[PDB]
Design a protein around this ligand. Structure first.
Ligand SMILES: [Cl-]
Ligand SMILES: [Cl-]
Ligand SMILES: [Cl-]
Ligand SMILES: [Cl-]
Ligand SMILES: [Fe+2]
Ligand SMILES: [Fe+2]
Ligand SMILES: [Fe+2]
Ligand SMILES: [Fe+2]
Ligand SMILES: [Fe+2]
Ligand SMILES: [Fe+2]
Ligand SMILES: [Fe+2]
Ligand SMILES: [Fe+2]
Ligand SMILES: [Fe+2]
Ligand SMILES: [Fe+2]
Ligand SMILES: [Fe+2]
Ligand SMILES: [Fe+2]
Ligand SMILES: [Mg+2]
Ligand SMILES: [Mg+2]
Ligand SMILES: [Mg+2]
Ligand SMILES: [Mg+2]
Lengths: 160, 161, 161, 161, 160, 160, 160, 161, 161, 160, 160, 161
């Protein structure tokens, strides 16, 4: 037998900094989600359908992404905060307009916010990775996914 | 071509500035509910945590589908929705969801209360909506039935009999 | 927190003693129908037995979903349903389904008649329900549409033209 | 057998000669729309052809389900529908769909206009239908919501902002 | 060729007793179903959701169980009777209450009725088996299934 | 390298005759569809359910059949016309009645129209095949399918 | 400790007689399958559709049964024979008529075949159960399945 | 204006006694193939047993689907199929499958030549069928390259280097 | 009129210490079989590796589903199962599986005799179980012919001619 | 009686020429597949999404076609060659540009590739049909499938 | 040109040490699986159902993990040992109690087992990552998966 | 209060010419692997043909999914992939697959070393990629252990004892 004795083995808990870094990624993921739906509903113009559908896909990814980070925070004993007031006050994403926007302006607007969201993740990467690699892999999924969304969307307005 | 209309441009039903405002109120409260639902979903702890952790997600799925439905019903009727965080926070009627871990019992009351508030908004607005466009009044009936069932499924956890 | 309500306990819509009674009548007749549907499903014999053996099950599936919907709509509105056998038998309005094997033709008339009776109950009660809670009136519309289609799909078997 | 009805033959709700006529108008326009939808689906060409080629099929699927629903709602209520080509052409209110290849832009206007006309018929008829049978008024609400969403999803392609 | 001659080969038909034994199992299966839905709708209290869902599963099993016995009776030339009046008058299950019941009382109430339903099946087992083994296997499915439901539900109120 | 030089390789385009032959098959497929739904809704009498369901299957086949021919016409540069007025004026199918019809009369009525629809396809077969075999295979699917529908339906009224 | 120390541990071997009894079951299941498809093809007349469909369901159950019985023989190292000649020379089922048959006749003809098939299983039951009870459970499923099928089909001609 | 035929009773395509006899030829070998395929499926034993056991069942499904298509194609064209065990044994052209357990290598060889035998039948009947009804030939094409693909998947087990 | 029992607390069927001990015997060998099956699944190497790799997993699924059914059947009958690794190793009757890579031929032989060992256990316990509770025996029947079918599918790889 | 008495009955063997004609088809199908993915990746500009998706559908049909043609050759004992070098050295399709290309250009470039691919099949049709009509049916599916794909894509640039 | 000219190109081989570290992971994953089912069976008391279900989910993730780790060892030519004796003699997890345990105790007991299981993976992480980073990604999934499972279960007893 | 960035045009992550060149290296070998995998899939012949035929297709799916992920990952990062047949043939590092039919044993050896060759490429590029973008390395990790698992499933067919 190589069995341990301990009857109260605890789990890995994150430092205050780690939790704060994930909280930063959470509010931006939620803000991207909210802006994503906004764009999804108010976009109009050439190739409306394509963008209308792609935006919902980006939202699906953002929502499952935010849930993953939030639950990951819970796992490491951190407490996430995704309430509306908190998101609006702490998000680093540029405010999205409130009215109808042409497909061309939606492509640029959202592409910018996806990138803003990816910059947050790339900014906290090295710190969350140094403390917990396993969490860094989740961020890699977010980065790859979001950046792929950016590509799919931005390509609509490309030169040649 | 006997009964055929010769019109070349027949526009559809446009919603009034009042009707749109009434769906906007519904929209924002459905979104607040969804945000508070996820928050509760994440931070709830204590006795029968799993049952509530799972029920809260179903609540959110319904609220999310509800908000998409209403918002698109606005677009259909030529209205323009606003589901941005700043707006939701500044215009929602739902009392703020507390922060941190809350026990299962508290989460049952907090969420039950906020679901009723949301249904409240829909009920208050119903008559004005129905009298203008019955079709949208049906979308509201679906949201009322779905939400109350949700509140029942949740509040029952704390019933003492 | 500008538009946010400060209430800590906002209760939901409660159904009246009359409203609940009106859904209870619907509940019991949907259950009788389901029990008579299975009975017919089992004991029907004769020409085109399969078609009716199968249609009767679809009828039962719809009645069962209907009864669950109404009963839960009562719970949602703070009412308490009674779908026990003793109660159903003693309070249903549907004429008793005969015993033993009944031919396809007879089963078509017997079941058609009992489906209409069930819809009857729903129609009689509709106005009182609608005037109090339109949302539930929609649940009834679904049951009326579904049930009449059912009766049509069944009664057509015996039409002579 | 206390509450049980002794009736041996209880007939169901029969629709009036007016009600049936009002659903027939809806039926034929839903069919014209479906035929024009396929025609557009086939002959549309130009910028963003795929998006519209696909959206048009969803439009047709909805119109087809709509027409089947209404026609069967007539059968249920003892009415007899007529969805034959001669009748549809001779009694539809939708302006004729042009022939040959039409660009994406034109197809967006042509189809948007014809969807509104179809919804028109449903709206004009709604009050008469509702006052007689609310249950069928709900089927119409579904068709109105579905169709307007359809028109929005389509017309947005040509919006300039 | 080893082919039979007979142009009117009949099937196995049950004796009056056999049919009566299956009829006994049928009315109790239907009564359990009705009581199951009743509990499913009116239960309240701690762990409401778990019980609310488990009860629907027990009903699903009871309904498909009653249909199996009824159709099996039809196969052997017996005529089942599952009408409301018959069920209420012939069922051996203890009446279930009509109002809201705490989860703790629902666990005990229903556990008792499932057992009552299983006792009926165990009571007619040896007789239906002696006459037709194939039918006994259907009863074994009912017994195993129902008793498994009893276990899943009753465990909620266990000591330690 | 065996690579071609041409930067503007065109596709196979049909002659006016070919397109006209497919147009003939299209309007009859659509008319069968419309008549199919009509029968589906207004049929009554013995074995109503069986016919009610079979007719919807025949319609499903006719609709996907009409879409195939129409899109095939588009592929070869032809322009289909399936508008109501055109169908009613060019179809060769005998008008279907407007009221309730007994199942026995629906079987005969529709069987006749399916055959009428198959005769059109068999009539243009050799010409479309001589010009484009690949299109003839689509017609073979229609023929096999439709004729199978005819069999399934007509069998209801058979002698012995 | 409780581990057995031999290296080749054999399983349960079926006696040649046991294999023979299963062979009698297999052969009738296969014959019934073949006859069912024949009826499925040539059935004709009133309520054609229902029968045409029920017969296919009967064949599916029969085909599944024969594969189950054949493999059960293999499991116990017996060797099945499902070849056309053996089936025609040893099946106990009455030959099936050769042309189009009305729905009324088909119902009567098939019910008899099913009963004859169920009969062989019942005749062989006890000898099988005495050697291997587990195999008897399979026979039980066939009996319940087949007899149910007999009920669904024979009912078309029941007059009460 | 009007291209509609008058005619009350339009006739379907009827196969000639010769045509029917050719399909009966294909049908009978397909069924035999299926019987022999299950036989092999059960008694195959040896190196790479599983792959063979599984592939044989996939062969039987195809032959079964094929025989049903052929038998019904005869029916649609007013011909009468005969798939009874006696007929199949007395008229099939396939060499009969051996009686007991067979090694994987022998099963591959055996089944491979019985498939070749089956498609050979279809090829022998191809031209006569095609001439009278090309639509039936397409079905033949399907069986042919569907069965030859199977022959390849099974026979390749024994091919060397 | 009334056949209802009065009794507040009707009791469930309780297995005897002997019965429970027999199922614990079946449980323990099933689990061991599963462990050994995954071992073989991972380390099998050689001619026809894939077929073996795959079939072994299908064997493990069955043994896992089987052990869960047996363990829960004990629970339902008030018995307490023990599937801990220590217990399984100290009480299983199956000869242990060798330590490293094993050729396909040896895996077939090895696993085949361990399955035979497992069902042998079930057969040894069959009669005693059947006598006390035939419903539990049916489950035994299922494991028996389910495991023997597996033994056939795997062992046949090594059988010659 | 009707049973054939030889033991090795061979199937239909493809002539070396037949194999060569199919080889010409395979190679262009594979080239088209490779080019389609290249366009799928680098396509860029207005209505990016639709094209990006349609191109994948085109590749799926192409990949399925090449596997069908390659295996049809195997079935008839011919031996396919789908290796990169052979495909590049014998494909008849024009080379595909190397960088990002606009949606307008991609539509034109792909339509040409598809037509060239359909062309080879049409050129080889008769020689194939003369030897094995069944294989010609496969070619027909490719032609209908590919030409349909050409229609869906070329329409993006149609101006009327 | 860029093609490599040797014929047997070997892949990455795992060192005996690397294999040993994965072996430590496998053994605890398997032990946890076995303990999870044991709890799944004997858990009893308040909120029985939720736990009973969550424990099964925990076992599924564990079983999938052990098969992933065992095969990852094979991929790199290491040889796993998941036999009962080896698992009992080398697992580092505390033994699991032998009888019925309350839901409260089970939650505490399992959380500890999961943490101990996650612990071994974390202890072995760096040594594994240094040799094969790709394998470290698998370890990361286990850590995120297992720790999430620990969170979902431990929360039942959290008091705040 | 406000953490929102102002900036109208926030930029995305751009790969370096070096990084892009490394992924182009992985892409080109993945595609070649796929081409060679289908080749083997079609021409493999001999003992245990089926298992190989099937596993090879499963290898091709993975390599195809892999090349698409790599090519798009380049696109997302502003790099331009080249998967044309000419490029692949001129730059792939995999030894080319032989021309005709190949025995199962030789296919196992052949494909096994070409997979090793492919992952070797990915491993050679791993560190440089990881340093510039770890998120792209995770994708590499996926291809690596996904391809090595395949190498194991195929190569094990030839391993002895
Ligand atoms: Cl799309
Ligand atoms: Cl749950
Ligand atoms: Cl049916
Ligand atoms: Cl396989
Ligand atoms: Fe979640
Ligand atoms: Fe939406
Ligand atoms: Fe419910
Ligand atoms: Fe319909
Ligand atoms: Fe039933
Ligand atoms: Fe289409
Ligand atoms: Fe089988
Ligand atoms: Fe069939
Ligand atoms: Fe379990
Ligand atoms: Fe393939
Ligand atoms: Fe595995
Ligand atoms: Fe892609
Ligand atoms: Mg719970
Ligand atoms: Mg019928
Ligand atoms: Mg588009
Ligand atoms: Mg194999």
């Amino acid at each position: 037998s190589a069995r341990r004795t301990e009857s109260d083995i605890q789990g890995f808990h994150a430092t205050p900094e780690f939790g704060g870094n994930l909280q930063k990624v959470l509010v931006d993921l939620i803000e991207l989600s909210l802006q994503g739906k906004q764009a999804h509903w108010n976009v109009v113009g050439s190739n409306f359908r394509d963008l209308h559908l792609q935006l919902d896909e980006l939202v699906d990814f953002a929502r499952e992404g935010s849930d993953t980070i939030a639950e990951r925070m819970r796992a490491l004993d951190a407490v996430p905060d995704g309430r509306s007031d908190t998101v609006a006050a702490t998000t680093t994403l540029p405010e999205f307009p409130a009215f109808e926007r042409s497909t061309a302006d939606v492509v640029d607007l959202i592409t910018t916010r996806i990138n803003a969201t990816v910059d947050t993740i790339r900014r906290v990467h090295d710190a969350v990775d140094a403390e917990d690699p396993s969490t860094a892999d989740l961020l890699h999924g977010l980065i790859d996914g979001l950046e792929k969304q950016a590509w799919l969307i931005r390509s609509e307005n490309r030169k040649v």
